[PDB]
Curated annotation (Swiss-Prot):
Functional description taken from the UniProt entry: eIF-2 functions in the early steps of protein synthesis by forming a ternary complex with GTP and initiator tRNA.
Origin species: Pyrococcus abyssi (strain GE5 / Orsay)
Binding-site residues for Mg(2+) 2, renumbered to this chain: 15, 38
E.C. designation(s): 3.6.5.3
Region (G5): 173-175
This protein's name: Translation initiation factor 2 subunit gamma
Region feature (G4): 138-141
Annotated ranges, domain tr-type G: 3-195
């Protein structure tokens, strides 16, 4: 209903203005929000209600027109995905393209076009085939007219031949809220709500799981927080969760898919009877809180019984390594047998042991099983020194 209809990724080089623009659009100038941010994926969702003024016709994200003061009309709710660092957003796009319906590429007008990070974010969009792009030429008030036009030409040159070739370039000042109405209008024109088939099997990627019952009769079942990427969820629905609950058998860890029932659904800031793709959805269940407490189910996948992707203990991956540009160490060394990698697929995260090599392929034994479909994309990271670094992605093969 009134919940977010699309997730918009905020991309661009660090310091160019992604967070400032997100706050300008969501109207957040205070405050924490650090409770709906992912754990397996360093992601945060922030909703905004796009509205249009009947009087002057300009778009904004406020019930009160910033331009004439008139009350605006509701158009659509959207959600912006803004992440802390470069590495984070990159991993997020490669592992969960199903989480983004479009993207706003922020490029600071007072910076040398182009910079490595910007190049890598566009490379990520290219890989996942995300073409609903809008470019925000930020900090426009910091440059003169000549430099502004020149920067525009460089961006244009830069996007030619890419998934962003058809993107509009909108000059703005995210900090001062300049020309924001033109950008909001562009979100409606270039990031339309996709025509989704509401009857495809439902599938939600669990981002978080909690026990809402307070410190110290509403001993409420466990709650799952996540993204619906296909179909829809409805109160009363019977759902299965995979891989499920860990248990020990003969000294080793196994996982038992678990079935429960949806008792409540929160989306757009309120309880609803049905939830769909777009923004975060809080799923209240009948599960024993002890099972969801402390994000024990983060990374799991939710769907209707008998209609979930398979669970894998090991993966055969068609590997595509990145031609890395963002401290030297650009050259990505080939993956060797016995190497331990970090894999991200959907909202799931697990280390993996390379057990075999093939033509543009690797076999990997997973530390923690994952629920995914053949063909799904997996972000691959290698430990460089003391930190994990993204080096490419793999496609699950049977
Ligand atoms: N002058 C000016 N500074 C801006 C503008 N937009 C963002 N900034 C500033 O530039 C810095 C980087 O912005 P931030 O939003 O944190 O962007 P991020 O690092 O891409 O996510 C902050 O100090 C902002 O206040 C703008 O339009 N004009
Ligand atoms: Mg930021
Ligand atoms: Zn108005």
């Amino acid at each position: 209903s009134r919940q977010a209809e699309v997730n918009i990724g905020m991309v661009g080089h660090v310091d160019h203005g992604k967070t400032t623009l997100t706050k300008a659009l969501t109207g957040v100038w205070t405050d924490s929000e650090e409770l709906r941010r992912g754990i397996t994926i360093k992601i945060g969702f922030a909703d905004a209600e796009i509205r249009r003024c009947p009087n002057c016709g300009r778009y904004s994200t406020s019930p009160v027109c910033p331009y004439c003061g008139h009350e605006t009309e509701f158009v659509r709710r959207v959600s912006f995905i803004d992440a802390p660092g470069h590495e984070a957003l990159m991993t997020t796009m490669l592992a969960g393209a199903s989480l983004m319906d479009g993207a706003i590429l922020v490029i600071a007008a007072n910076e040398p076009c182009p910079r490595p990070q910007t190049r890598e974010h566009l490379m990520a969009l290219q890989i996942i085939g995300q073409k609903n792009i809008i470019i925000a030429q930020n900090k426009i008030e910091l440059v003169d007219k000549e430099k502004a036009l020149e920067n525009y030409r460089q961006i244009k040159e830069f996007i030619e031949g890419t998934v962003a070739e058809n993107a509009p370039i909108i000059p703005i000042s995210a900090l001062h809220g300049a020309n924001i109405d033109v950008l909001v209008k562009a979100i409606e024109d270039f990031i339309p709500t996709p025509k989704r088939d509401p009857n495809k099997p439902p599938k939600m990627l669990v981002l978080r799981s909690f026990d809402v019952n307070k410190p110290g009769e509403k001993l409420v079942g466990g709650v799952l927080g996540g993204s619906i990427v296909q179909g829809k969820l409805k109160v009363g629905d019977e759902i299965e969760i995979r891989p499920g609950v860990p248990y020990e058998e003969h000294g080793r860890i196994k996982y038992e898919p678990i079935t429960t029932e949806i008792v409540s659904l929160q989306a757009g800031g309120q309880f609803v009877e049905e939830a769909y793709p777009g923004g975060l959805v809080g799923v209240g269940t009948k599960l024993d809180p002890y099972l969801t407490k402390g994000d024990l189910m983060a990374g799991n996948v939710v769907g209707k019984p008998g209609k979930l992707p398979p669970v894998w203990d090991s993966l055969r991956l068609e590997v595509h390594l990145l031609e890395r540009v963002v401290e030297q160490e650009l050259k990505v060394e080939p993956i060797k047998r016995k190497e331990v990698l970090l894999l991200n697929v959907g909202t799931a995260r697990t280390m993996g042991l390379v057990t075999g090599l093939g033509k543009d392929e690797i076999e990997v034994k997973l530390q923690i099983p994952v629920c995914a479909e053949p063909g799904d994309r997996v972000a691959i990271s290698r430990q460089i020194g003391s930190r994990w670094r993204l080096i490419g992605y793999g496609i699950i093969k049977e």
